[PDB]
Ligand binder design. Sequence first.
Ligand SMILES: Nc1ncnc2c1ncn2[C@@H]1O[C@H](COP(=O)(O)O)[C@@H](OP(=O)(O)O)[C@H]1O
Ligand SMILES: Nc1ncnc2c1ncn2[C@@H]1O[C@H](COP(=O)(O)O)[C@@H](OP(=O)(O)O)[C@H]1O
Ligand SMILES: C[C@]12CC[C@@H](O)C[C@@H]1CC[C@@H]1[C@@H]2CC[C@]2(C)C(=O)CC[C@@H]12
Ligand SMILES: C[C@]12CC[C@@H](O)C[C@@H]1CC[C@@H]1[C@@H]2CC[C@]2(C)C(=O)CC[C@@H]12
Ligand SMILES: [Ca+2]
Ligand SMILES: [Ca+2]
Lengths: 343, 343
Amino acid sequence: LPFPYEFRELNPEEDKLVKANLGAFPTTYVKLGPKGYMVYRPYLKDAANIYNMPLRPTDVFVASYQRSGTTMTQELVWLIENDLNFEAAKTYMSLRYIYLDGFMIYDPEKQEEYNDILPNPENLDMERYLGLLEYSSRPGSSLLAAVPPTEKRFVKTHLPLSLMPPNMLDTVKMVYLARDPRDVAVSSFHHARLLYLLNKQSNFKDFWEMFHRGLYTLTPYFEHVKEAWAKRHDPNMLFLFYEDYLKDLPGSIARIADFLGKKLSEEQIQRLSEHLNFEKFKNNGAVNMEDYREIGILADGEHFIRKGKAGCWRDYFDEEMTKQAEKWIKDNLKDTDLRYPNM
Amino acid sequence: LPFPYEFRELNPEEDKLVKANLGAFPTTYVKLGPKGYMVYRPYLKDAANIYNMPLRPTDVFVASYQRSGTTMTQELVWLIENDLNFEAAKTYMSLRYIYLDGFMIYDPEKQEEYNDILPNPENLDMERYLGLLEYSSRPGSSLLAAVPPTEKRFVKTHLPLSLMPPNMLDTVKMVYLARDPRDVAVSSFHHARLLYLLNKQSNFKDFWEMFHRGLYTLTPYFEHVKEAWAKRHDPNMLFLFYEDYLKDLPGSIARIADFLGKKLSEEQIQRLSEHLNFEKFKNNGAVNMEDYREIGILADGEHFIRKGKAGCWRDYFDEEMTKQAEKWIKDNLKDTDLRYPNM
Ligand SMILES: Nc1ncnc2c1ncn2[C@@H]1O[C@H](COP(=O)(O)O)[C@@H](OP(=O)(O)O)[C@H]1O
Ligand SMILES: Nc1ncnc2c1ncn2[C@@H]1O[C@H](COP(=O)(O)O)[C@@H](OP(=O)(O)O)[C@H]1O
Ligand SMILES: C[C@]12CC[C@@H](O)C[C@@H]1CC[C@@H]1[C@@H]2CC[C@]2(C)C(=O)CC[C@@H]12
Ligand SMILES: C[C@]12CC[C@@H](O)C[C@@H]1CC[C@@H]1[C@@H]2CC[C@]2(C)C(=O)CC[C@@H]12
Ligand SMILES: [Ca+2]
Ligand SMILES: [Ca+2]
């Protein structure tokens, strides 16, 4: 099966906005497909392979537009499939899951350019840093095909459904997370600050400008959610809202367990929910990627697991931005049954 | 005289490293003085008293950074002062010497927490175990003041000179032992394993990391040795190298005897050297503290008197560690006349 998509460069206006906020970061973008999904240029080298990647009936995918509850979901899905063996789950999440599209953010051609975004390149633990860069050079497809058949493959991706094998849900199970885009925006802003992707001179309004305009990584945001929403009633797709994890963690866990063919005891569900307690999780070395800070690539006062709250976007949007966001959500939810819990 | 030192908590980075290797052990550390000597928290309660402890012209101290030849030296110094009465030396070394700072490793506040580091707490001889804990609760100063004036006091300590009465050498005699830090590191690692101080999951590279970085008990290592080295000329200080005990035991014994005001016969020196034979000493119940194993607090395959060799650090350091250790020693020996025999 051939790759049915053409890519396109950003036009002058789009390129101006993006550069003004992300120009310092080495990697550039291109829009892919008819919906114009923003992908880091390096994604193109593995695009056809991903679209045609061989799937296995045992594969399990945790998909979502970034910062929507992926990490939490991965931990839950992993423990449940592995009979709540919390002990075995103490290994790095990055070793337990393959980040299908994680590679695209790195361009080997510009290797020398990446350390220049760091306040102090000199403090880097080079062995580990170069180690990271090498891993990031490996296309997702290869990482997946590498896993032996007698080992259950856990996949993490932020890729929209239209870029992966169509009908994939006929073979694999997927848990897709969606979150209020406004909160997603604030979390993505900080995430961007965490890894030095955003220009230090840019602020949140700038980021929000790129975001709702479909000029940030893997956006248009709504097209992304919509594809998954449409596959909501499929037996192998479990569409969940990040907000529900907060309002009723126990309840979400039951749904995930059932979706995976497991019946947990009220006690087991309780044990899992406690394990997912924000403070405890935020301090869980296996999932917070704090070891990245010892390597030297994380910014001061930023963490992968941040605040873990819903609705905090009100502390970042001014009157104008607020209305602009309302109109935007309004327009994209018009003539669809998609609705957010907290909205 | 007031205690001229302030203490300081470990900063986040330092605390992370330490905890990762010693966290399971109940007792915590703090850095003391301008040099930042690592002391177990409980040391603070008796710090001022030790700094101001009353000394006696008959007192004799055997000092050193741990695992540098203290025990051997204690036996030699004791026999020589007691007219080679080998018979009277058959009593426990712990009863013949007061371990000035031995107490700091135990915190009565966490009494319940200590037995939890044992594989089998249930096998403990409780009477003796609680007996140990009680003795360990007594500050060193008190143990010393307790000894009657008509009895010669033998003191053992791993405290640097700057923490004891300044000018102390004006009253007491001290024999200070120094050993190649690399070998000291390997011996301290095993010692740490012996008493269950180190996390069972940590390995030697981890320990060596803490060690040369000044994050282990009574380090910075070089500052410790340097203080004693500077007083090497004083008539009441005898600076010796552990390595010399191996290359020329008879020769070291003569120096110790002369330092103490005793003239031994070539035969007496010979009798002493034989008494200090590694195998024989390692099996000497009065100094190997094997009775601690019957109590139940020693780890399998670990002993106080281990290999008794010099240079064996080469079997524990990999190429990188080796260079890192070379640079480190290089830097601390720069602009000083301090030199190690085997180096
Ligand atoms: N155990 C947990 N409970 C609640 N929120 C959690 C969590 N672990 C992570 N999060 C939150 O999930 C978001 C990250 O999403 P993802 O894992 O998909 O990248 C962050 O949102 P915030 O930035 O709002 O804090 C993060 O703090
Ligand atoms: N009679 C003896 N001859 C040689 N080395 C001895 C000895 N008695 C003890 N040692 C060694 O001295 C070190 C202990 O030092 P200290 O008494 O100051 O704590 C240990 O080093 P190793 O771990 O290298 O074997 C130990 O085996
Ligand atoms: C590219 C970048 C961020 C830019 C540069 O510092 C190199 C690193 C290499 C590791 C990457 C990281 C981005 C976030 C990634 C993709 C992860 O979440 C795991 C691997 C991480
Ligand atoms: C604290 C600890 C080790 C931790 C715990 O098992 C209690 C014992 C009590 C006796 C201590 C021992 C450490 C080493 C000591 C200080 C000696 O060398 C003699 C007394 C010993
Ligand atoms: Ca560079
Ligand atoms: Ca206990």
